[PDB]
Each structure stands twice: as structure tokens, then as C-alpha cells.
Ligand binder design. Structure first.
Ligand SMILES: CNc1cc(N2CCC3(CC2)CN(c2ccc(CN4CCC(C)(C)CC4)c(F)c2)CC(=O)N3)ncn1
Lengths: 201, 241
């Protein structure tokens, strides 16, 4: 099912095995480094990311000490970090907008798992330049980069907010509206695993 | 969408960044505080590093990675075996150029191996306004247009970005801007640059490298610049009368 889909839930407790395999996973975790709902480092280590892919890529936003922690989780989950995207934050004039240096950028680790095949490696470059939207928002160019890399494939975002829903993407987050699912096999395995629409233990 | 645009025209998104309180008195203070430049040709693989004294407030480490030569290289194997912590002061800083590949991970292992924790990640973003096409590392997913210089601290104004135009093929120099970022931190005056060259020698710094053509290093002369009453100068105050 090509158009957006999402699942309001707690990503800690949802049974992601019902969702199937994805060519791309993306995650903007709420690392404990609290203004929103944070997750401890063991909770992050424990997320069942390994079930979501057999071959493909993981995009993992990091800041501060998660830069090292996210490298850990990425290896723990079975990936090799093969690239790193930085987003240079500008204004509308395209000038540039951590107690030692002011931070003009945000980092996104790129991990590979297995032997992904038929992707378009090399189409983009590891630098995004784009204006800041709201606080805490990734730039939208990341989805265009990801689509050029793996066109038409199943992609899943972890810890999205409603502004993150995207065609070809399934967005999981705890501030989304309900459960909107259109992929048949997913609607199936969801009804089988949750015959009553509550995600609990 | 500058990422769609680069996909269109070969102009990396950074090609379009514009502009890439005047208290330049700190620059003059740095300059009057700067020890004479010292330098020593040395094969660092074969060089007992402990002969370098006293312990350094700043270490800048620029090993020649194999990836710098696309068209002796040091591996992260060789680098990780350098006894950097035997010459670093108990409170001190490291700035380590990690390239853009495995270095971003292996260089973090070095920083921890030698005793530092990373506090800054400083990116050299390379524009190509003067040549909108490049060949990729096999593992690469994207085109690599930047290099990383990791900043490490052990013990108790500027952005984290340098934007210049990509150097000519086979030129390995790093932007001199890194020296300005370091010097404005005001971290002390014992400043060491391992794997520098004739072209990087600089006031306020001791350079050690295989390719230096001359030396002037003398440990007693060098330690003399820091004997009392100058042992704790940040590098950003007046010379004591
Ligand atoms: C308890 N378990 C949960 C929790 C949960 N969510 C909790 C976090 C979520 C979405 C739902 C995202 N959050 C958030 C995350 C990361 C960052 C930092 N990145 C910001 C973007 C960047 C600069 C590119 C890189 C850094 C950020 F600023 C905010 C804000 C929010 O409110 N919600 N969903 C399901 N289960």
C-alpha cells in the first residue's frame, strides 16, 4: 500500500514482528542526554530493530553522547556504519544558524545490514543544507534522499510525529492519531496479534 | 531542495551556503603569547614518542590515511598503536582528523584508548563550485563531500564547521582554519602537531613528521618556553612582564 500509514503506540511495547521487512529503517530516537518522553540507554539497546530488516539500510539521528551510543546500538542491532549524513542548518538567507563550539549541524548515522541489492548508491552526497522548520524536526530532504536510494520499497520510521507520515512509509510514534493501516498483510497480522486494538506488555 | 538540485547539476548543496562584534584582539593576544615555531623530522612509526617533552596541552593528529590518496599510508591499525597518552598532559585536548569512512568509528576507539571523551565533532565540508563527479568507496551509500576532525578532552565563538572548496586531486592539506578553531579555545601553550609538514609549521606549535626537511627541536630549549612564571598560560593573555 503506497500511501502513508501510522501506528500510535509505545515503541518499547509494540510487537514489530507483525510489520514485516523493510528496505529502509529510519529513527530519530529521544535519547536521554527531559523535555519529552525519553528512553533509557538499555531501553534503546533493547528495541527489536533486528527483526525489521534482512537486507537494507538504517538511518539513525544522533546528538551529543548518542553519537557514541547510537554507534553502539547500530552495531548491537547488526549493522555496519557505512556513511554519516550531516544537515547544515541555515536560515532563509542561507547563512549558518556542546559547550565548546556552537552547533551548525546535526548528524545521521547510516547503517547497512546484510547484502542490499538494487539500490542507487552514490546518487546524493552526505551533506544536506536546508532551513530549520519547527524545533526538533528533521529536514524533509532526507525522505527524498532515501527515495532516490531505494525507490518504491517498504520503509519504516521509528519515533515519528504526525508531520513525518510519508507515502511508502509506516510511521510509529506515541503522538499519532490512532492506527491507520492499509497494507493487507499488515492489517492481517495486526488483527491476529491484537484482536482488540490495545498494545500492552 | 538542494539535494534534488545536486542530483540535477552536480553542485553539492554546500556550494550555496552564504557567508562561508569584532574581537580580533584575542588573535593578537594569541600571537604575542606564541612560542617560536619548532619542528623535528622523525619517522613516527619507528620513533619512540616519549622523547617528546614536556606533556602537551593540545595534540593535533593528522595521519596520512589511505583514503587521502585516491588518485607510506597509515592504517587505523598503526594509528591505534600510537602511545598518544604517554605524551598528553593530564588535562589536555586532542584534535584527530578521521577522514570520512571507517575513521569516524576507529578514531573514536583511539580517543577512548588514549583517555579522551569526545566533546566536539568538527566537519570540513568541501564545496565544488569550481568543478560540478567523484568515485566512491565500495561500502559508500552516498557521495562523500566532507571530512571529520574529532575533538577529545581528558581531565577537568566558533562553529563546528569549516567550509572551503575541495582541494586539487592529491593535495592532502587540511584547512588552516582548524588551527584558528584550536587557538581560540585558549587551551594552553604546549601544542603538538603530529604528521605536520614544512607547509604547516606555525608559531605556537611543535610539528613532528616524517617529511619535514629541517629540524630545530631541542627538548630543553622547548621546555624553557614554559618554565615559571609561564607554566599555566592559556595562550590568550599577556606575556608576564
Ligand atoms: C516512550 N516511547 C515512545 C516515544 C515516542 N515519541 C517520543 C519522541 C518523538 C515521537 C514520539 C520525537 N521527539 C524527539 C526525538 C528526537 C529529537 C532529537 N532529534 C531531533 C531531530 C534532529 C535535530 C534531526 C536530531 C535530534 C527531538 F528533538 C525530539 C519529540 C517528541 O515529542 N516525540 N514514540 C513512541 N514511543
Amino acid at each position: 500500500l503506497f500511501p502513508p500509514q501510522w501506528i500510535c503506540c509505545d515503541i518499547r511495547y509494540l510487537d514489530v514482528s507483525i510489520l514485516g521487512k523493510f528496505a529502509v529503517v529510519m529513527a530519530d530516537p529521544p535519547w536521554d542526554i527531559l523535555p519529552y518522553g525519553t528512553l533509557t540507554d538499555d531501553e534503546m539497546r533493547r528495541l527489536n530493530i533486528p527483526v525489521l530488516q534482512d537486507d537494507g539500510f538504517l538511518f539513525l539521528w544522533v546528538t551529543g553522547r548518542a553519537m557514541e551510543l547510537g554507534r553502539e546500538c547500530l552495531n548491537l542491532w547488526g549493522y555496519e556504519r557505512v556513511d554519516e549524513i550531516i544537515w547544515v542548518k541555515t536560515n532563509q538567507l542561507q547563512r549558518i544558524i556542546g559547550h565548546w563550539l556552537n552547533h551548525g549541524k546535526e548528524h545521521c548515522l547510516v547503517g547497512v545490514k546484510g547484502n542490499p541489492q538494487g539500490f542507487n548508491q552514490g546518487l546524493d552526497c552526505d551533506v544536506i543544507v536546508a532551513e530549520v522548520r519547527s524545533t526538533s524536526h528533521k529536514p524533509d530532504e532526507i525522505y527524498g534522499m532515501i527515495e532516490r536510494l531505494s525507490p518504491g520499497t517498504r520503509k519504516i520510521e521509528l519515533f515519528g510525529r504526525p508531520h513525518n507520515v510519508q507515502p511508502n512509509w509506516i510511521t510509529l510514534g506515541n503522538q499519532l492519531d490512532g492506527i491507520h493501516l492499509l497494507d493487507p498483510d499488515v492489517v492481517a497480522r495486526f488483527k491476529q496479534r491484537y484482536p482488540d486494538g490495545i498494545i500492552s506488555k | 531542495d538542494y539535494c534534488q538540485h545536486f542530483v540535477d547539476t552536480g553542485h553539492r548543496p554546500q556550494n550555496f551556503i552564504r557567508d562561508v562584534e569584532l574581537i580580533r584582539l584575542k588573535d593578537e593576544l594569541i600571537a604575542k603569547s606564541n612560542t617560536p615555531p619548532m619542528y623535528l623530522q622523525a619517522d613516527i612509526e619507528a620513533f619512540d614518542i616519549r622523547e617528546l617533552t614536556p606533556k602537551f596541552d593540545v595534540i593535533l593528529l593528522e595521519p596520512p590515511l589511505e583514503e587521502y590518496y585516491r588518485e607510506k599510508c597509515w592504517t587505523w591499525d598503526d594509528i591505534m598503536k600510537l602511545e598518544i597518552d604517554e605524551i598528553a598532559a593530564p588535562r589536555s585536548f586532542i584534535f584527530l582528523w578521521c577522514g570520512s569512512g571507517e575513521g569516524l568509528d576507529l578514531g573514536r576507539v583511539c580517543l577512548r584508548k588514549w583517555g579522551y571523551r569526545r566533546c566536539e565533532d568538527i566537519c570540513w565540508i568541501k564545496t565544488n563550485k569550481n568543478n560540478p563527479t567523484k568515485t566512491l568507496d565500495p561500502k559508500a551509500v552516498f557521495q562523500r563531500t566532507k571530512e571529520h576532525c574529532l575533538m577529545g578532552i581528558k581531565g577537568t565563538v566558533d562553529i563546528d564547521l569549516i567550509i572551503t572548496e575541495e582541494p586539487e586531486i592529491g593535495n592532502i592539506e587540511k584547512p588552516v582554519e582548524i588551527f584558528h578553531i584550536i587557538e581560540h579555545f585558549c587551551l594552553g601553550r604546549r601544542r603538538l602537531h603530529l604528521f605536520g609538514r614544512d607547509s604547516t609549521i606555525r608559531p605556537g606549535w611543535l610539528t613532528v613528521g616524517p617529511t619535514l626537511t629541517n629540524s630545530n627541536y631541542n627538548a630543553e630549549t622547548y621546555a624553557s618556553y614554559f618554565s615559571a612564571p609561564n607554566s599555566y598560560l592559556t595562550g590568550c593573555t599577556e606575556e608576564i612582564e
